[PDB]
Design a protein around this ligand. Structure first.
Ligand SMILES: CCN(c1nc(OC[C@@]23CCCN2C[C@H](F)C3)nc2c(F)c(-c3ccc(F)c4sc(N)c(C#N)c34)c(C(F)(F)F)cc12)[C@H]1CCN(C(=O)OC)C1
Ligand SMILES: Nc1nc2c(ncn2[C@@H]2O[C@H](COP(=O)(O)OP(=O)(O)NP(=O)(O)O)[C@@H](O)[C@H]2O)c(=O)[nH]1
Ligand SMILES: [Mg+2]
Ligand SMILES: [Mg+2]
Length: 168
């Protein structure tokens, strides 16, 4: 069965775990879920083909050891997540993309820009800002709510379709 190794990255508190848990377990994150780094797995059907998603929900310390670089190099595609009410999380996106490009030694890595928490009303990053940044990188922008499930499948499946083609 075809396996896709997806990696979810972004600032503290943006909803990396919530997006992953919603995709895999069909509900929202809570006070009992893992806050150490962990991986999830689920067999799904995308465009009529069965495949297995292996999702790395990142956590822990920021560090640039050879081991950490090499480990991240193994991810096949990245969701770069910010929260639409957290401008600093959005301004950090360039940092995550820079590290992905550095370890993959390539500008052509499957990636999706995810603006999470779209259910909130108090938005401080507007859609045009996020679209502009996504267009500057040549990556899709998908607005999500891990709480209501809006956009969640589209975000992960878009990343899969990018990897699937990139492998062909
Ligand atoms: C989980 C750890 N984490 C991470 N924080 C940061 O930066 C946090 C901020 C705020 C402080 C100063 N620093 C710089 C900037 F200002 C933003 N960068 C991270 C990062 F670049 C990666 C990464 C991604 C893709 C890759 F190819 C590689 S390769 C490699 N060696 C990586 C590393 N490390 C890495 C990862 C990883 F690996 F999990 F995906 C996690 C990162 C937490 C630390 C506390 N955090 C926070 O938001 O505090 C406010 C977030
Ligand atoms: N309103 C709203 N809150 C969300 C959403 N996703 C996550 N949150 C909230 O944001 C906080 C962090 O969510 P979590 O998924 O743990 O974020 P994380 O990016 O995994 N944080 P960490 O880097 O510490 O592991 C929690 O209070 C959670 O309820 C969302 O779509 N909508
Ligand atoms: Mg945290
Ligand atoms: Mg988390």
């Amino acid at each position: 069965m075809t396996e896709y190794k997806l990696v979810v990255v972004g600032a503290d508190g943006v909803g990396k775990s919530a997006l992953t848990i919603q995709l895999i377990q069909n509900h929202f994150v809570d006070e009992y879920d893992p806050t150490i780094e962990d991986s999830y797995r689920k067999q799904v059907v995308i465009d009529g083909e069965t495949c297995l998603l292996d999702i790395l929900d990142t956590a822990g310390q920021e560090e640039y050891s050879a081991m950490r670089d090499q480990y991240m190099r193994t991810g096949e595609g990245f969701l770069c997540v910010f929260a639409i009410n957290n401008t600093k999380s959005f301004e950090d996106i360039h940092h995550y993309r820079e590290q992905i490009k550095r370890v993959k030694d390539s500008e052509d890595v499957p990636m999706v820009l995810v603006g999470n928490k779209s259910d909130l009303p108090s938005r401080t990053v507007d859609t045009k800002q996020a679209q502009d940044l996504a267009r500057s990188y040549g990556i899709p922008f998908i607005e999500t709510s891990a709480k209501t499930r809006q956009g969640v499948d589209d975000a992960f499946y878009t990343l899969v379709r990018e990897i699937r083609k990139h492998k062909e």
